[PDB]
Paper text:
With regard to their common enzymatic activity, NDPKs are NTP/NDP transphosphorylases encoded by the nme genes.
Since this was not successful, we depleted the nucleotide from NDPK-C×UDP crystals by back soaking. Interestingly, we observed that the area where the phosphate groups in the nucleotide complex are located was occupied by a phosphate ion from the crystallization liquid and even formed a hydrogen bond to the imidazole ring of the catalytic histidine (His135). The B-factor values in this region are markedly higher upon nucleotide depletion, reflecting an increase in flexibility. Nevertheless, the electron densities of the residues that form a linker between the αA and α2 helices have disappeared in one trimer of apo NDPK-C. These data indicate that conformational changes in NDPK-C upon NDP removal can occur, with the helix α2 displaying the highest considerable shift in comparison with the nucleotide complexed protein.
Author numbering:
A (entry chain A), B (entry chain D), C (entry chain F), D (entry chain C), E (entry chain E), F (entry chain B): 18 to 169
The structure:
């Protein structure tokens, strides 16, 4: 949907525990993306098994699920042009060792299991993840007055 | 409840529009309070009339309600010692003209109608506001590992 | 003029030298005031003797003038409600020893001679200072799109 | 001129509108470059047609000129070693989608039409741009006391 | 000694644990004070009983000593005009509930037992504390090039 | 030693002079590494000749040694997984002209002689540098409570 593209972001429990929710939000705000959904939730194992369904035969899958249910996450939807790809970029490589400073993981994380945040890896994944984590009435349209200064 | 005291905060639509959600969250995080609930909602006029029920005979009540329903707000619950009173302090006086720099309003706001954020003004108000805006299953207990360094 | 009130600010040479121009500007921006004039100039002794004409029989007047002409200053005009009084507040007491942290002087300055910035001390002073330092065609009207979120 | 090299920077109207002037200035300050000229101006279409003369057969040229005249810009000259090339780097790729986080565009911009700032693309361009936008008596020499700690 | 006045600061173990050492240092740097001594130490109970000798009949004394020996502290000496009194101010009231936002405790602390930092409360205390915690050859004179812009 | 790896960092005198000690510390803190040693020292020429022993036939060696002894440095040891390599990365290329924004040198430095900080370039170098600059009883173990949220 061009500038109506959406991605799903989740601050993982390490993010909440280390108090970096604000910091992360702020990076998306100042980049100019539009916050259209935000919930602090304790994810169920049922949901997380579906979230991570593509990773079900990998050896990390049990621990990854038990982890993401271990604490509160902050679930989020961000809207704007190319937001999925750009989010991946702001966040940085999956392994923080490969995430250059300036990215969230580059700045704040050391190890791949405690890398602070999930972002949808494709427009497809975002559609699925958004529907899985959020009811349609939790996604907000609002008239974004900043948008005259972010888009032509 | 001592260190289990809770207060309700809401970023008003100006806060969302001006992109200060992250900024505000970050101030509460770094102060050490524990985020126990968070959503982005479009508040109904029905809810807001109950929220602002103590102010129903003042002349600004209608416009205040029509305002807070004008856009998305970010509703929030924060937990910690004396959190209600301390929140009021971080936020600053209701009229920003009286809010000393260092406070959120002192730093970011000019006029009382566009003062960015609501905080519960008493323990009583917080009880009511929390119940009004949030179901009990939206408030999260999580084992706060920072708390050994915030409380004796 | 209400929300059209204007004040004159000058980053003094210490501010420029210590690299705090951006920092200071940013505080005014984020407070919500509207930047309507800005130049980097070397003030002449003639101008500064008139600028500081109220202080001409104090013993320190010579040194204050020779100082402010010692380097580049950043001259500025800021517009908004109560901007003169609020600027005085953001800046802090004239002697930084009396300027509480959170204010510019409270955060960045130690001694009264090197207190980083001048702000008009009254609406009267601002009228005079603005005319003294700036031609009318250097003050800009621009359609401030943030203003819907700072004023009612 | 080595460490006397100069580049022309302009905060575009989006930068002013979004209140990022201070932020941008501050990045140049803290990098260690020396601010030698600064004004807030409303650029004329005549000037901007000459400024963007190299881009006169591109399809974006009309809209780019009408844009940059649409609002106030902050025009700037920065001095230091390799300042032109390094400015290009701090700013980031022309298309923000290609600008890595840590750069100004990477951090703050989404689309190429609203990319916040112009920087001279060569020493040649800077010479021309500086003369076009600034009288010689607007460029200041000042004894930079930080410079002992930026240059060997 | 005027502008040669010195105070002793210690980031307490909560400050180290919560990762606020840099943050605290930065506040003193940007205020303009001169760092003349710095080490990370594990304080002995013997030292701490002497450090807190003024507080020996209060009921909190045992726990305060066992606490400050519980972890690493960052010991510091800062030099400049009125630095003792001004430090007390930047830090904020002993009980953070009384520390206004903008101060370190106001911004970062909730409870008096975990208030992040100690600062000498008098010139006398600073003399004693500096000698107790630091050898004379750990205090550095260095030619402070910023000082021409902090003092007249 | 895995997550017990250590690196030696030194803020060079330019760092101290330009007041960026806090800033630098803060970057390491927020990345999650563990500060295990810290002092402000005036390095002797004898020590620095040993520190820079690998560079003894290069033409810059005399000036490099006379420089690093010219003022106070802040010596530091940081512990965590891959801390040596990651420190190199946070710091940026040796020549700041090649250091992308987001890195310390990319953000703060212009020229190679005044590039603010040294970091060990290998685990080997760190072992040597740590022993050269620090007694064993200056390196602290402390029970890092943040570590559950940085490592699995």
């Amino acid at each position: 949907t061009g500038a109506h593209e959406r991605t799903f972001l989740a601050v993982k429990p390490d993010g909440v525990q280390r108090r970096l929710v604000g910091e992360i939000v702020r990076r998306f705000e100042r980049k100019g993306f539009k916050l259209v959904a935000l919930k602090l939730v304790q994810a169920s194992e049922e949901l997380l098994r579906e979230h991570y369904a593509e990773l079900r035969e990998r050896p990390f899958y049990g621990r990854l699920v038990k982890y993401m249910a271990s604490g509160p996450v902050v679930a989020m939807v961000w809207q704007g042009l190319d937001v999925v790809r750009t989010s991946r970029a702001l966040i940085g490589a999956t392994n923080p060792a490969d995430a250059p400073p300036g990215t969230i993981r580059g700045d704040f994380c050391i190890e791949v299991g405690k890398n602070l945040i999930h972002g949808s890896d494709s427009v497809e994944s975002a559609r699925r993840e958004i529907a899985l984590w959020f009811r349609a009435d939790e996604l907000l349209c609002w008239e974004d007055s900043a948008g005259h200064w972010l888009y032509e």
